[PDB]
Amino acid sequence: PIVQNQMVHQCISPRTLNAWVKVVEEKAFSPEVIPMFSALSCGATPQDLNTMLNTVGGHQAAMQMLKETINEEAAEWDRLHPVHGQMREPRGSDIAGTTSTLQEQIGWMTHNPPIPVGEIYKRWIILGLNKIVRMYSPTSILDIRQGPKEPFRDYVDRFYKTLRAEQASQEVKNAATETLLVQNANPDCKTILKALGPGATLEEMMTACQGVGP
Amino acid sequence: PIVQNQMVHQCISPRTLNAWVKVVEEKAFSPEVIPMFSALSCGATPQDLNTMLNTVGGHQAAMQMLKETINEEAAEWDRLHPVHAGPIAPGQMREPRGSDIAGTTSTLQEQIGWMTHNPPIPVGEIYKRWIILGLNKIVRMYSPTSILDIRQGPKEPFRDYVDRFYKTLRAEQASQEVKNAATETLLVQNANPDCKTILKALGPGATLEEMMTACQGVG
Amino acid sequence: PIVQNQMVHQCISPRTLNAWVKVVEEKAFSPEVIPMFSALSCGATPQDLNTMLNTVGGHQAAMQMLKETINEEAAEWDRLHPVHAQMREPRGSDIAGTTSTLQEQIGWMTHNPPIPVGEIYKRWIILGLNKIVRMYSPTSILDIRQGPKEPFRDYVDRFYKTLRAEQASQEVKNAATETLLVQNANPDCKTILKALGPGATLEEMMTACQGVGP
Amino acid sequence: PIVQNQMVHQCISPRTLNAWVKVVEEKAFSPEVIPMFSALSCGATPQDLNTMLNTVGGHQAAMQMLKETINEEAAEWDRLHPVHAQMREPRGSDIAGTTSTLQEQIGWMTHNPPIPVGEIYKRWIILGLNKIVRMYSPTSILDIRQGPKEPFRDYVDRFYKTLRAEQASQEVKNAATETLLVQNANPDCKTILKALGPGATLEEMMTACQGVGP
Amino acid sequence: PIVQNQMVHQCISPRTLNAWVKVVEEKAFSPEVIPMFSALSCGATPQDLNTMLNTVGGHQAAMQMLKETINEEAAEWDRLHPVHGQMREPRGSDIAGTTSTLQEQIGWMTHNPPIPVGEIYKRWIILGLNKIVRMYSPTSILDIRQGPKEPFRDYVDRFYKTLRAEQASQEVKNAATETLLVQNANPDCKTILKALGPGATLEEMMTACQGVGP
Amino acid sequence: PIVQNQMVHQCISPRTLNAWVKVVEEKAFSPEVIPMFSALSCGATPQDLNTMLNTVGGHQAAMQMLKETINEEAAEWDRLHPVHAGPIAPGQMREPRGSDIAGTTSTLQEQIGWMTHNPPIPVGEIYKRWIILGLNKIVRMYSPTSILDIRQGPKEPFRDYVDRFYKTLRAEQASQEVKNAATETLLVQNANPDCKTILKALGPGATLEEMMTACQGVG
Amino acid sequence: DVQLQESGGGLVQAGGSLRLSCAASGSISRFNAMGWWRQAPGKEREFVARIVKGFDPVLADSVKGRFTISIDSAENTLALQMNRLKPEDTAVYYCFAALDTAYWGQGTQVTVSSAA
Amino acid sequence: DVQLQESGGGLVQAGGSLRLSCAASGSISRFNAMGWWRQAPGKEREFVARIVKGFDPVLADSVKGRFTISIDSAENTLALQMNRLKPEDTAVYYCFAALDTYWGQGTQVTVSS
Amino acid sequence: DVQLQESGGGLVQAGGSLRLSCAASGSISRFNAMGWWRQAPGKEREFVARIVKGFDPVLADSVKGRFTISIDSAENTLALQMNRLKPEDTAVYYCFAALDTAYWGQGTQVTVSSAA
Amino acid sequence: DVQLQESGGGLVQAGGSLRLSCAASGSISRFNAMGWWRQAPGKEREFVARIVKGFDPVLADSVKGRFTISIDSAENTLALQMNRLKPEDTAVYYCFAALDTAYWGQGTQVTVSSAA
Amino acid sequence: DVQLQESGGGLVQAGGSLRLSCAASGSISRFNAMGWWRQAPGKEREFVARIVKGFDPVLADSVKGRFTISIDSAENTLALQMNRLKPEDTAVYYCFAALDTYWGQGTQVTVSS
Amino acid sequence: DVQLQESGGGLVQAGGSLRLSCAASGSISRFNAMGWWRQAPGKEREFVARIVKGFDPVLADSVKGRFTISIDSAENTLALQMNRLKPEDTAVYYCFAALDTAYWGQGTQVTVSSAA
């Protein structure tokens, strides 16, 4: 990555490489993997980002899909930045580290106006990973319903865990989806939640339904 | 985070990231997780704080409650601190809004600018205050037992009962000295028969230290 | 903590936090936990010391006792050191990190002359932990007797471990307690140790009683 | 390795050595081991690269093959780059760290212009490892067929893992090989994939065949 | 400890404290513990050395013996450096960190003529530890003899392991003890070793006795 | 060791110390331990090298053999390099003897002086050379099997046989290319019947790469 | 095991005041939420007030300036104070309580008008 | 078990418009992908349109400017709208839907001036 | 398993002195707490003194200037020294021991009056 | 389980051309190595050509300029193209396949002489 | 089972010399420590000398300048050499040796002018 | 299983030369050590030469300048070359071999003198 001592290259750390590998091994493409990827890639060059993706041994269907998404984003980059000052010009393939050298990547990122090819590529990789997280979500939110004996907290944990994966975003918080949380609750709690009226907070809903299981 | 060699931004550490994720996995929302969060987030930018919260995989009910609490605090910030910018001054950024402090509408560079001013605007510490405000509520809500239900077991050592008593008091009260007195009455009343005789025999004004030493032969 | 680059503040390390948390989990309030605490808290500000104590999840009985001891020492500080109007002289609650800011704590520690509020507070915390170590001592020194088949070395190990906890220090008033070591030895070794005479070293005692255990 | 303070030599780290040794122990010559090798060998001198390879205890068949590949590349270097009389231009054996000193290696890498003998040598080592990855591939791509009850995702994961090893690269000449993916699918999914038409993305294929596996 | 940035104090590292603790837990007072102690104490102040010894939880008989040896060495120091320029004077009790402050210890060690109180104390601690290693040696060298079916290498490993502990020195290499290695060997190997003549190296002896077990 | 920010002494690391101790515990004197030793001892002073060797608890036969080898190399050093010091020169230490290089009769400060001269005397590297000289002998002596006894098993994959063959060759020869030819004859002759037919059928001049690919269906 | 009864409703003039009270069985210490709804015949059920244990009182937008909801834990009763009554206030008012399910009262009639 | 039926085909002028519709048994939203092919002797089966669930419509290069494919899960049937017709479009058109392994019998569309 | 017996009580003059002693079975150093209570008939049991193991003695406010509580580990006895006796001192005095239940003596009668 | 059969041999003139073909059971792409040997009666078996999977073809020195060895995976056949035939070429030619033993054909006779 | 026997005691002048010797059964080197005590009515048992195996000889303060204690494992017996005798030294002298739990019967030494 | 026989000893003048040879059963490839000792009657057994597998030859101090020990692995024989013979050389010479134990020959008589 590029770090401050002045901005200098400082090699990917052995810990970071291992941390990313183990996060994929243990969590696969659970939604929280994505914020972890972005954090582990602080300051990464395009080269460094490719190293992290390539160090993944399994999940090669997902990784091939990721390449397709990256190529699509690169082509759109070229569409938005066509061949015509006129100092330098990163292309889509240069941003992905495919046709650029480490030397070119450091050059673009450290110029003043910086062209942050690492951040652009990281955006595309995350764009791809979001799609993978959505693809590998095992259950639809429509199929999440509170069990007869399930504590409301456990249902809400399940509800927002899938909502996070199917949305590939930690807070859908959509209006219609706050309607669904109430409608799919168990009979006793739903009556309690309906009586709460409009605008009840999640905090208020969980307090209201305490004791339903008991 | 923001660190000293002049104040500079430094990447969130792989050790730090893993330490937080694991403490949440192992301790959930036990009260001690909150001091650990604050320590692990030393010097954090709002971006760093969001990274830490988003790396949590489970507990999505708690994190959704946390999001609501953050939104409430952001709204109260804007009500008490409108920003009149217009033309920002030559050496200085814009004035932070609620959503800028939470890292939702601000860039990392904007966050660093406020935090590194000589008149510093500590947007990281303000957000950390709001996040802890949310986490405290989660710890209380997720407290498994009421203090009224902590009774010394027939064979339970007084120390183990006292441990359970003040551990429960810590999560459900989130107020260590707000109601200590009535609960120091309850500690004696809810002890088991054998310890109760010893504690009653100690007379008035016995310290916790004195009670625990006296009650060691019990259990 | 406060460290040498000039004296600067540094965040408490993730390694240190885990080390302290784990030593408490594994050793509880065995006497050796205190030298570990003081070392892990090297250079600590009052804020750092409070963080370390607050990260302890269990042992809330001990932690409440510790709070009581801190309050007693704070009150005695105020009695011995009144304060009149860069902030002015520290009160007890400022040393304990309750009414002082981090910046105020750093200011005192780096003044010339330095007000080492962290070291003063660390003294009080250790004062409290010693009491806890004593309270959690499972056995009285009077109840450590050599077993019929117990090797003298193992008995002496048990003897001085307990002596350390009940004194909350490795050595204090030990002369009369070296009399007890002989009296509480088993019949066979006791006769040998008595014949050794006054002023025998532990080394000499262990040699005399070698093989006797069996 | 050679690192930025000015460019200085630094001992190979104990963490790096273990990381490389352990990845070889755990993953053998799975294709992802190569991106890990190149990253763990960031900035390496030829001496450092030889150390990493020599610390491998097992796989001595592969390591002998690797030595053969290095010797071939060294010979081709000498044929393409003769050397005449701070030391003069590097020969093949100097790049491989066999006839050069550490000081000589550091000299070449830090010259202006730089002779990146470490990076050149790293290229040759990777050239050898690719051959080993190919040799240790357990199955031909022709033998990857979707099972009767195998989910399409799991078949595609197996397909591209093998394709990666037999190509020793994640992507090469893959168009005709995307034909094979359909032909080797199971009867039920194959019919669905054929109906999808030309130019279907993997994402589109995985959606079409969802639930069909069962 | 005191390290170079100029010589500065840098606190005991969390790793060092744990490393020493775990070495005592796993190896007790095996002779190799002593070189490990000395290495872990690189640059230690007297305060730092006391911290390491105090963090040991068990082995309190050994630790009490260690205090006795230290007190003896301190008294002899005072005998060799009696109360009479006349700038400063570390006493025995100051060297052990009992009557000196961290501030005094750093002062003595960083003067120019340095009075290396850390190294002096470390000498005394090792002086004590050698005695403990000797005390806890489980078997006499006279009782080590090659088994009828024991490979000569395994006997020599056992021979020099006890010789190391009873001597508390890795190489006794004493003349009479090189006589004993031959005399206590099994019948077949002893005849082979006797025929080798005087001055045979250990290397030569082990080669000569290869096959005796077979 | 001696490190660059100017060249300064730095304490041997807790990670380094533990890494060496553990590699010896787990791998003993397998040939790969020697490259690990050399790498872990990068920049070591003679004092540091002695620390590493003394922290080994077991294997005291090997370490006693190592001591003898060191003494032999020290004696040869003194024979080839007498030291004529007398009055040492104003900017410079004494001339190193064999025992000074081994850290037996020299102080740490003396070792650093030689190693940090502008005309450097690399006493650490010389001692490391002698120690490796000793360790190589130990690896060969402790090699469990002769190369003549490595025969492919009835069900053993050619790759596993080839792995065993060159692993054994590495420890017992300690000479990778001194005798490669006759042993490349032995690799074919000692293979099992099924592989032998394939290898013989390949004709003369087949590479190891070619032999291993051809023989994959065997076993 | 439990049950509620409303009272305090009646006929008052527009611009008037009224105070409804909901009596509870057991102790309101265990209820996790109580509140008020109203319905006029032919008009949809409307939410009036809510109190969840530990939280501030929440009121509907149509009543926010004029109503108050309070809890008297001493008497185990739930009060809804109504002021500045409007034509929109004619309705039957129900209290609700939350435990193992939601329990409701039978309602109280409130009729507000200024018609001739 | 699972039925598909095309309709809407017929005889039209060149440059004309036509709308084909494919009706499905059960719920049409349960299918993960549907689309359109055409077939004639010597005119080897050619791909016309595809929609995979959640994805954009994909059309063949020979038809891209003139056709639209849509699915109405509400009406449980999907539409293929054809405009700007060419002579090569006379053919029998088949829709496909697939769960666990389906085709209609096809409907003939004939384009001429 | 542990028995307590008070002694040393009797009739003494006001302003007088008295020393109560409580004999314990086993070794007295084993108890984790001991102390003294008193009761006069019709007055509630009053706490007099407490000694908890390792701690300083605590005395009641009505007696603080005049009484002392001590432990004689040699004789295994617990002493309560009473001086400056007052009309408030007439009562039966009990010692307690703690350990695992707790254990009480039968009491000793102390009667304070103005002498001859 | 795998059978080999050579064909294409016969009598041709010196300086002539000939193409031998070796048919294999199963799929030929499954073999890890194939090649050609020849023997004339009284002369030792001579190695002619080898193809190891993934590698370039290797040919003997006595034939290098004139022969080619190829694999036709479509027809599952192994071809050895012979040109510029010499007196040294009279022999019986065998193909081999490797896999798990290895497997040999029965051979094909090639007789080289000067034509008409 | 295990026998110790003192000898060498008698009547000597003050300032004189005497050498006591304690003989042991079995091997004397097997004992881990031996030494010398003295006893008289009203002259409570006083410690004279001690040797623990591998350790230095330790002597009492009242005798330090005048006595020597030695063990000859070769002769299997140990010696207590007394010089510069004082009046308080008249007493019966006992040696002790201990393995698993031993005393001699003692020998009388009488000092006078 | 094994056994040695010395030969080559006899009577020579002082300052003379002699070469002893030790014939071995089996192959000397397995012996791990061989060597030479000598004894004159009434004089203690003296060590002469030693060769351990893989090591340099070692010789005694009394013979170092004049003797050589060699191994002929082709003929399976062990040679000890003696030159500059002295009065100290009269003795019976034995070779030894090391395997599962030490095996010895019967010895060969060497008598060196210059007496009248």
Coordinates of N, CA and C in Angstrom, one line a residue, chain E residues 4 15-16 19 27 32 35-36 39-40 42-43 153 156-157 160-161 164 170-171 201-203 206-207 210, chain F residues 8 11-12 14-15 17 21 25 51 53-57 59-62 64-65 67-68 137 140-142:
Chain E
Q4 N 18.5 1.8 22.3 CA 18.9 2.9 21.4 C 17.8 3.4 20.5
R15 N 5.0 -8.8 25.0 CA 5.5 -10.1 24.5 C 6.6 -10.7 25.4
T16 N 7.6 -9.9 25.8 CA 8.6 -10.3 26.7 C 8.1 -10.9 28.0
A19 N 6.5 -14.1 27.2 CA 7.4 -15.1 26.8 C 8.1 -15.7 28.0
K27 N 8.9 -25.1 30.7 CA 10.2 -25.7 30.9 C 10.7 -25.7 32.4
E32 N 18.2 -24.9 29.8 CA 18.1 -24.0 28.7 C 17.2 -22.8 29.0
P35 N 19.7 -19.5 29.6 CA 20.1 -18.6 28.4 C 18.9 -17.8 27.9
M36 N 17.7 -18.4 28.0 CA 16.4 -17.7 27.5 C 16.2 -16.5 28.5
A39 N 18.5 -13.6 27.5 CA 18.2 -13.0 26.3 C 16.9 -12.2 26.4
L40 N 15.9 -12.7 27.1 CA 14.7 -11.9 27.3 C 15.0 -10.7 28.1
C42 N 17.5 -8.6 27.7 CA 18.4 -7.7 27.1 C 18.1 -6.2 27.4
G43 N 19.1 -5.5 27.9 CA 18.9 -4.1 28.3 C 18.1 -3.8 29.5
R153 N 23.3 -42.8 20.4 CA 22.9 -41.4 20.3 C 21.9 -41.0 21.4
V156 N 23.9 -40.8 24.7 CA 24.6 -39.5 24.8 C 23.8 -38.3 25.0
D157 N 22.6 -38.3 24.3 CA 21.6 -37.2 24.6 C 21.3 -37.2 26.1
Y160 N 24.6 -36.1 28.3 CA 24.9 -34.6 28.3 C 23.7 -33.8 28.8
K161 N 22.4 -34.2 28.7 CA 21.3 -33.5 29.3 C 21.5 -33.4 30.8
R164 N 24.5 -31.4 31.7 CA 24.2 -30.0 31.7 C 23.5 -29.5 32.9
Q170 N 26.5 -25.8 30.0 CA 26.2 -26.6 28.8 C 27.3 -27.6 28.5
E171 N 28.6 -27.2 28.8 CA 29.7 -28.2 28.5 C 30.6 -28.4 29.6
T201 N 36.8 -38.3 18.9 CA 35.8 -37.3 19.0 C 34.5 -37.9 19.2
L202 N 33.5 -37.1 19.7 CA 32.2 -37.6 19.9 C 31.6 -38.0 18.6
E203 N 31.9 -37.3 17.5 CA 31.5 -37.6 16.2 C 32.0 -39.0 15.8
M206 N 30.2 -41.9 17.9 CA 28.9 -42.2 17.4 C 28.9 -42.9 16.1
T207 N 29.8 -42.6 15.2 CA 29.9 -43.3 13.9 C 30.3 -44.8 14.2
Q210 N 27.5 -47.1 15.4 CA 26.3 -47.2 14.6 C 26.2 -48.7 14.2
Chain F
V8 N 23.7 -0.2 14.3 CA 23.5 -0.2 15.7 C 23.2 -1.6 16.2
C11 N 18.5 -5.7 20.5 CA 18.3 -6.9 21.2 C 17.7 -8.0 20.3
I12 N 18.1 -9.2 20.5 CA 17.6 -10.4 19.9 C 16.1 -10.4 20.2
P14 N 12.1 -11.4 20.9 CA 11.3 -12.5 21.5 C 10.7 -13.4 20.4
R15 N 10.2 -12.9 19.4 CA 9.7 -13.7 18.2 C 10.8 -14.5 17.6
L17 N 13.7 -15.5 19.0 CA 14.2 -16.5 19.9 C 13.2 -17.7 19.9
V21 N 13.7 -21.8 18.6 CA 13.5 -22.9 19.5 C 12.4 -23.8 19.0
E25 N 12.5 -27.8 17.8 CA 11.6 -28.8 18.5 C 10.8 -29.6 17.5
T51 N 23.4 -17.4 22.1 CA 22.1 -17.5 22.7 C 21.2 -18.4 22.0
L53 N 21.9 -21.1 20.1 CA 22.3 -22.5 20.3 C 22.0 -22.9 21.8
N54 N 22.3 -22.1 22.8 CA 22.0 -22.5 24.1 C 20.6 -22.6 24.5
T55 N 19.7 -21.9 23.8 CA 18.3 -22.0 24.1 C 17.7 -23.3 23.7
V56 N 18.4 -24.1 22.9 CA 18.0 -25.5 22.6 C 18.1 -26.4 23.8
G57 N 17.1 -27.0 24.2 CA 17.0 -27.8 25.5 C 17.5 -29.3 25.3
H59 N 18.6 -32.6 22.5 CA 19.6 -32.8 21.4 C 21.0 -32.5 21.9
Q60 N 21.4 -32.8 23.1 CA 22.6 -32.4 23.7 C 23.8 -33.2 23.0
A61 N 23.6 -34.3 22.5 CA 24.6 -35.0 21.7 C 25.0 -34.1 20.5
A62 N 24.0 -33.7 19.7 CA 24.3 -32.8 18.6 C 25.0 -31.5 19.0
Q64 N 26.9 -31.0 21.6 CA 28.3 -31.3 22.0 C 29.1 -31.6 20.7
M65 N 28.6 -32.3 19.7 CA 29.3 -32.4 18.5 C 29.6 -31.0 17.8
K67 N 29.9 -28.2 19.4 CA 31.0 -27.5 20.1 C 32.4 -28.0 19.7
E68 N 32.5 -29.3 19.5 CA 33.8 -29.8 18.9 C 34.1 -29.2 17.6
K137 N 27.2 -31.3 9.4 CA 27.6 -32.6 9.8 C 26.6 -33.4 10.6
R140 N 23.8 -34.7 8.4 CA 24.3 -35.9 7.7 C 24.3 -37.1 8.6
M141 N 24.9 -36.9 9.8 CA 25.0 -38.0 10.8 C 23.7 -38.6 11.2
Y142 N 22.7 -37.7 11.4 CA 21.4 -37.9 11.8 C 20.4 -38.3 10.7

